[PDB]
Amino acid sequence: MEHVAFGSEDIENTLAKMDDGQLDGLAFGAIQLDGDGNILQYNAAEGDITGRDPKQVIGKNFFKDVAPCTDSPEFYGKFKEGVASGNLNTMFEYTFDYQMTPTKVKVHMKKALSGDSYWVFVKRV
Numbered sequence: 001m002e003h004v005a006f007g008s009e010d011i012e013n014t015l016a017k018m019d020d021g022q023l024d025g026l027a028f029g030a031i032q033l034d035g036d037g038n039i040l041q042y043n044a045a046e047g048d049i050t051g052r053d054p055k056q057v058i059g060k061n062f063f064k065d066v067a068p069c070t071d072s073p074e075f076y077g078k079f080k081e082g083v084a085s086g087n088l089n090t091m092f093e094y095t096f097d098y099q100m101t102p103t104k105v106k107v108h109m110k111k112a113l114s115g116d117s118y119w120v121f122v123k124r125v
């Protein structure tokens with residue numbers, strides 16, 4: 001298993017060296033989005049939590065198609081502000097409840113070391 005802890009201060013650096021294969025070895029959910037909320041990466045742990053198949057949601061827009069419970073001021077609003085500002089680093093609990101059993105998770109959104117990409121990290125609480 002890849003050894004990186006959820007909430008690590010230098011996680012964006014560690015994950016920059018990871019392909020889809022290594023991202024799947026994380027102990028927590030990991031989603032990479034572009035500026036518009038499109039899914040570039042989606043790991044196995046994220047799939048075990050959300051139920052959806054990794055390979056089928058890549059390409060999809062996270063806020064419009066895949067995950068609406070997130071289209072609101074407390075998740076999407078925070079993400080859109082971060083994108084426009086060029087800086088993003090926030091952590092909060094939330095509840096995923098679309099087409100699945102209501103699940104409490106802890107989310108960490110952070111701008112990737114890369115240009116126009118952003119990370120969404122999920123774990124159970």
Ligand SMILES: *C(=O)/C=C\c1ccc(O)cc1
Binds near residue numbers: 050067096097098100
């Ligand atoms: C609330 O809906 C949050 C996240 C989420 C992620 C994946 C799927 O499939 C549903 C919901």
